[PDB]
Amino acid sequence: LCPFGEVFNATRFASVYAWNRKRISNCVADYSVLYNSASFSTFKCYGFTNVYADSFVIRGDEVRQIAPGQTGKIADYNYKLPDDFTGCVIAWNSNNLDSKVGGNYNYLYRLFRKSNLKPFERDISTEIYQAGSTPCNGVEGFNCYFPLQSYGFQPTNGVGYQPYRVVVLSF
Amino acid sequence: DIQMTQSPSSLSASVGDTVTITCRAGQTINTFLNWYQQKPGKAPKLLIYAASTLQSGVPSRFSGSGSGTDFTLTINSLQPEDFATYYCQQSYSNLYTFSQGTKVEIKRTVAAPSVFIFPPSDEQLKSGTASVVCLLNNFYPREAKVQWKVDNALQSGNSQESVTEQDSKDSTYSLSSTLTLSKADYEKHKVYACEVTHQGLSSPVTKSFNR
Ligand SMILES: *[C@@H]1O[C@H](CO)[C@@H](O)[C@H](O)[C@H]1NC(C)=O
């Protein structure tokens, strides 16, 4: 009786830094067109109460970072999973969808941050970072960069730099 | 991409009614379908977003809904103002898309035109050319019929009509027919008449003059 389908077939996914979360309560799941479906670069499960479907898009070689105890730009500054994590990370390549001549500007990630993210935390602020010494008071250039950045997904890209749609079931 | 087919293409309904517009799609979408209202003489206005989202500035007499590939704007308690063209939209993962359009005319009781004929100005005749403008004012439905008769023979080649968009206030139309001759052709006939046939008329109507 549970949805999923609304999560998976979603026409476009979130930017990782504003990752989307759909709540799933009151029902049991069929599965099938998950698991028995192939066309997944990954289908990794680790480890009920209430279930969270967490969707977003990242690069190929960032997918290893959607696992408990991983580090790097994503695991640190965009979407952290707990070590505790009992759940599933399911990912698939979507270059035929989410890549454009120019560099699909629809997918962004947080480049810089003062600290790391807590598990299942989501920071959406765009207040300029302040790398150097001087107080920025809203501007940028000389040190003092702007915190988000585009994936610029282009068809020619190698898999390492291609759009992968990630769904994260969490229990 | 992903093509969108809005229907019906035109829709004529009276005040206080409930109208329902559809939009079948090549393929499927979700919080990425959105509806637009282009009033005449006006830019587009966003009405509903993310499929069923109420928006802002728009009243709750407007409401959207849809699954998979079929979507549906509906207006209730139709108002004269509501008449416009309405557009679908889809959003990305390659490709943006609207549809043909859907024109919503506001049905009302038949109103016959008030015809008015203007002969050429002296200014114009000096400058070489004659224009006789017939004017049909404030009528419904659109579907009217003008003829120029000249010394009683039906002139064909050299007139052009222009109807205005339906008028929000009285939900009527107006229309100009304009017969343009050279001054030299203009002087080779005497009577110039403008004959009209609307549904609101029992028998046809002429306004004519002499050169
Ligand atoms: C996605 O899956 C849901 C649930 O299975 C289904 O109802 C829906 O029609 C599908 N497509 C879209 C675009 O929502």
Residue numbers in the entry:
A (entry chain A): 335 to 381, 392 to 515
B (entry chain L): 1 to 211
Sentences from the study reporting this entry:
Here we determine the diversity, potency, breadth and structural insights of bNAbs derived from memory B cells of BNT162b2-vaccinee after homogeneous Omicron BA.1 breakthrough infection. The infection activates diverse memory B cell clonotypes for generating potent class I/II and III bNAbs with new epitopes mapped to the receptor-binding domain (RBD).
The structures revealed that both antibodies interacted with RBM residues mostly outside the ACE2-binding site (left). RBD binding of P1D9 involved CDR L1, CDR L3, CDR H2 and CDR H3, with its footprint shifted upward on the RBD backside compared to P2D9, which used CDR L3, CDR H2 and CDR H3 (left). The binding residues of P1D9 included T28, I29 and N30 in CDR L1, Q90, Y92, S93 and N94 in CDR L3, I51, K56 and H58 in CDR H2, as well as W98, T99 and L100 in CDR H3, interacting with RBD residues including T345, N343, T345, R346, Y351, D442, S443, K444, G446, N448 and Y449. Clearly, the RBD binding epitope of P1D9 overlapped with that of P2D9, but they were not identical (right). For example, significantly reduced neutralization was found for P1D9 against Gamma, Delta and Omicron BA.4/5, and for P2B4 against Beta, Gamma and Omicron BA.4/5. In the aligned structure, Q452 in BA.2.12.1 and R452 in BA.4/5 potentially formed steric hindrance or a clash with W98 in CDR H3, respectively (top right), although this did not significantly impact the potency of P1D9. It is conceivable that combined mutations such as K417N, E484K and N501Y in Gamma, as well as F486V and N501Y in BA.4/5 accounted jointly for the major neutralization resistance of P1D9 to these VOCs compared with WT. The L452R mutation in Delta and BA.4/5 or the L452Q mutation in BA.2.12.1 contributed to significant P1D9 resistance by forming a potential steric clash.
